[PDB]
Design a protein around this nucleic acid. Structure first.
Lengths: 64, 51, 50, 76
RNA sequence: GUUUAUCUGAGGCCUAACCUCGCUG
RNA sequence: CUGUCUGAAUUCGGCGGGACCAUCCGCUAAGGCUAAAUACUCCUGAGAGACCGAUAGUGAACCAGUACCGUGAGGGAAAGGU
RNA sequence: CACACAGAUUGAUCCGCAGAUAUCCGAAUGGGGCAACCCGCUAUAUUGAAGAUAUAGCACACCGAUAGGUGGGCAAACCCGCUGAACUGAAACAUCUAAGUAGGCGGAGGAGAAGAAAACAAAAGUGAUUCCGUAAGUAGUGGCGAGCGAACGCGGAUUAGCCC
């Protein structure tokens, strides 16, 4: 029947304006006191899903 | 040697007879299944007696 | 409960008076022995006080 | 069976959820008691298998009213 | 510090729910 | 909705609007009945197939749930044409 | 079919509908029993009397006060209620899924269930239930894993409301 969208992928992975997928960064959860402020500032802005994972992310989001 | 089937035309009827199938509630479903399938021979009581 | 005594009770007494007892004292003793009647639809039916 | 005579209250089926959410079938039984009720309007004794919950409504209303209400609906 | 009407913790006693036995209630 | 226990008021009352409270809005529980549009084929009458044509099509086109196997539940064939 | 024997324009044979008879076992119902069997009681008649016969009535539960009525059991699927798994998936597995599925039990009808607001909605409004298409794989739910997944509103089929 209708293809179901994976919830784990739909709660993350916001689709951008034209053809990209926007996601968040990791490692910024609970040990932030010993990481440099440079890493914590770089891991704050949103990132894009790489082209090697784009096919899998699109198959999960039901955009073949 | 002694085989497994030692016939007895009363031990047969006391175990597989019509009145033994009709006495139980679940033994009465065997009759229904056989009549639905269309068995020409029902329980062993259908075998003719000696005349 | 709410019983209406009929003859007498040692600690209750004063028949024709609404008394509150524990459920199990009027049901097992007073009702079977005729000392009280469980009378909920009788507060108005008791007109002998007139 | 194990049902009340004046209400027809049957048992219930449910689960036995443990601490780790393990579920197992379980039967909530009725608190049936075998009392011996005295009829005040007829001076007679009957033996029923009523529940402790309908004993309460008997003490609330009266044995005669409860019996006349249970007579309807076929003792249920 | 005691008294009066309730709650509760324990014992004793009574029979009237409940259980059991003997003659047939 | 309740297996157990407890337990309310009667219309300036009661319930709901996704914890809960105040204001607004809606409804009036603890009684009952009710056709149509909806699902199926042990069957019945009529009629079709870019459906099979005897190792195919129902297990069974033919003395088929038959012959055979088992104590029993039960399993289960082959076999059309001058 | 064959050797035959008969019936039939006085109208046969045949078809449609409506009737009669309908042995025994089987719910089996007079008792029993190893289904197709055995053995009875009360009324009548037959040698009537022993051995036996012919006809009728003899099970159970309910209600009807009484002459008597109702139900036993079987059988496709749909529907309702009470119970109710595991394999499998999670690339292991216990929460979860499989699934309220398979299976078991009881009842009714051509359908059944539901059905007339202690309802939705939101500052604008609709007005019983059922079914079809969207809403929507959305909101949400989930060892937030596998997975599960509405509702509001809109368009249609039908339309009916009443009794304590």
């Amino acid at each position: 029947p209708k293809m179901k969208t994976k919830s784990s992928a739909k709660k993350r992975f916001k689709v951008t304006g034209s053809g990209k997928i926007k996601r968040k960064h990791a490692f910024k959860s609970h040990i932030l006191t010993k990481k440099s402020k440079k890493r914590k500032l770089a891991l704050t802005h949103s990132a894009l899903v790489h082209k090697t994972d784009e096919k899998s992310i699109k198959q999960q989001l039901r955009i073949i | 040697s002694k085989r497994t089937f030692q016939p007895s035309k009363r031990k047969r009827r006391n175990k597989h007879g019509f009145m033994d199938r009709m006495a139980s509630a679940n033994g009465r479903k065997v009759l229904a299944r056989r009549r639905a399938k269309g068995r020409h021979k029902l329980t062993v009581s259908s075998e003719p007696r000696h005349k | 409960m709410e019983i209406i005594l009929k003859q007498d009770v040692q600690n209750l007494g004063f028949k024709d008076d609404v008394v509150s007892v524990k459920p199990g004292y009027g049901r097992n003793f007073l009702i079977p022995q005729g000392f009280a009647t469980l009378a909920t639809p009788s507060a108005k039916k008791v007109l002998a006080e007139n | 069976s194990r049902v009340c005579d004046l209400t027809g209250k049957r048992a219930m089926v449910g689960n036995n959820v443990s601490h780790a959410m393990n579920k197992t079938k379980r039967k909530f039984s009725v608190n049936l008691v075998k009392k011996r009720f005295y009829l005040p309007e007829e001076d007679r004794w009957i033996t029923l298998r009523v529940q402790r919950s309908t004993i309460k409504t008997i003490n609330k209303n009266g044995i005669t009213a409860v019996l006349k209400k249970a007579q309807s609906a076929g003792f249920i």
